[PDB]
Write a protein that holds these residues in place. Sequence first.
Motif, short mmCIF file in Angstrom:
data_model
loop_
_atom_site.label_atom_id
_atom_site.label_comp_id
_atom_site.label_asym_id
_atom_site.label_seq_id
_atom_site.Cartn_x
_atom_site.Cartn_y
_atom_site.Cartn_z
N UNK A 40 19.35 -52.34 0.42
CA UNK A 40 20.07 -51.21 -0.14
C UNK A 40 19.86 -49.96 0.69
N UNK A 41 20.93 -49.22 0.96
CA UNK A 41 20.82 -47.90 1.59
C UNK A 41 20.95 -46.94 0.41
N UNK A 42 19.84 -46.34 0.02
CA UNK A 42 19.89 -45.39 -1.09
C UNK A 42 19.24 -44.08 -0.67
N UNK A 43 19.74 -43.01 -1.26
CA UNK A 43 19.27 -41.67 -0.93
C UNK A 43 19.04 -40.84 -2.18
N UNK A 44 18.05 -39.94 -2.01
CA UNK A 44 17.95 -38.77 -2.87
C UNK A 44 19.23 -37.97 -2.69
N UNK A 45 19.73 -37.35 -3.73
CA UNK A 45 21.06 -36.80 -3.83
C UNK A 45 21.13 -35.67 -4.85
N UNK A 46 22.29 -35.03 -4.88
CA UNK A 46 22.61 -34.00 -5.88
C UNK A 46 22.67 -34.56 -7.30
N UNK A 47 22.63 -35.88 -7.47
CA UNK A 47 22.65 -36.53 -8.78
C UNK A 47 21.25 -36.90 -9.24
N UNK A 48 20.26 -36.79 -8.34
CA UNK A 48 18.92 -37.22 -8.75
C UNK A 48 18.35 -36.29 -9.82
N UNK A 49 17.83 -36.84 -10.89
CA UNK A 49 17.06 -36.16 -11.93
C UNK A 49 16.21 -35.06 -11.30
N UNK A 50 16.39 -33.82 -11.69
CA UNK A 50 15.84 -32.69 -10.93
C UNK A 50 14.33 -32.76 -10.88
N UNK A 51 13.75 -33.15 -12.01
CA UNK A 51 12.29 -33.24 -12.10
C UNK A 51 11.70 -34.32 -11.20
N UNK A 52 12.56 -35.15 -10.62
CA UNK A 52 12.12 -36.25 -9.77
C UNK A 52 12.30 -36.02 -8.28
N UNK A 53 12.75 -34.83 -7.91
CA UNK A 53 12.89 -34.42 -6.52
C UNK A 53 11.80 -33.40 -6.19
N UNK A 54 10.99 -33.62 -5.17
CA UNK A 54 9.90 -32.76 -4.75
C UNK A 54 9.81 -32.60 -3.22
N UNK A 55 10.75 -31.85 -2.67
CA UNK A 55 10.78 -31.53 -1.25
C UNK A 55 11.73 -32.35 -0.40
#
Length: 330
Positions: A40-55
């Motif tokens: 799978x090619x998956x990315x952090x994105x503008x849809x990722x749960x905000x609390x789950x993005x850290x930098x």
Amino acid sequence: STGSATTTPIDSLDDAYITPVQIGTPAQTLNLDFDTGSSDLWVFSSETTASEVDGQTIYTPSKSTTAKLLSGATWSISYGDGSSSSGDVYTDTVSVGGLTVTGQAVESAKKVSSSFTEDSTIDGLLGLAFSTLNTVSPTQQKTFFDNAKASLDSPVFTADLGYHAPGTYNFGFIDTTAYTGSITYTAVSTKQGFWEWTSTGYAVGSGTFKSTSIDGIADTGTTLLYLPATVVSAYWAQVSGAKSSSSVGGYVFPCSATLPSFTFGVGSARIVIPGDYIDFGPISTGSSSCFGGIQSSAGIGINIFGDVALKAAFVVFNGATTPTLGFASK
Ligand SMILES: CCN(CC)c1ccc(C(=O)NN)cc1
């Protein structure tokens, strides 16, 4: 066509490697973990749960003129360490090292587990195992390599990982300046979706080689070398004070140790992992107990030639009609 991209360790232990990838129009560059153990090619994105993005750097499909929702498609994956991620899917233009695939499935994370959140240096994964492992439903998608393959000069990619240093992923050609001697190729089973092969044996240090078949996968997305308990015991028995610790979760050794090398067989050829490659440092900050880079596969269900092994070689992932794996010293 061909592509060539540099891959860089994320930290001082080579816990993983990141490679820049261009996604969309105008390009959005994300640093992805190239993983020959998943698809799978998956990315952090503008849809990722905000609390789950850290930098992390995020992919924003709404800013890409070439992004298209793959309507109805979802994905969900979990890895052998228990980490996981899931979301929905876009198609977009993806380029690696100069090589472009149009219409690539780009899996947008809505949710990621804590281990991913905590790795601020990894913006997603790029799978390079066989497309039969891809998790998109209800229409399974192809990996970047599968999509690129008919455009490539040769249906291959190579992994040349560094020890405490940058390395290279090449697509479509073999760089004959990147290795020494010859490349030994060995058969691959695709039955489980992996680059699954059979090593011909091992040696510990300057010890005699033990001829024995060891089935395993070539997995750039796994940090360590996971081998049968018998083999791993034979290795660590040569290190004074090494032991298996259930509280730590594997073999540890005194940080004052000098480790023996580990040799694995590829047909009649041999790849030697220097002892220092097997040192993964203190188990906790300041500790004098160090974590071993060779661990038992017992209870994983498969042996895994992770980065500890692969970084000692130049590795050819041959995606010809009959796929094979090549190893050279370097
Ligand atoms: C933070 C969790 N990360 C990033 C280092 C993972 C990356 C790759 C795998 C994997 O199983 N690859 N085959 C598992 C976990």
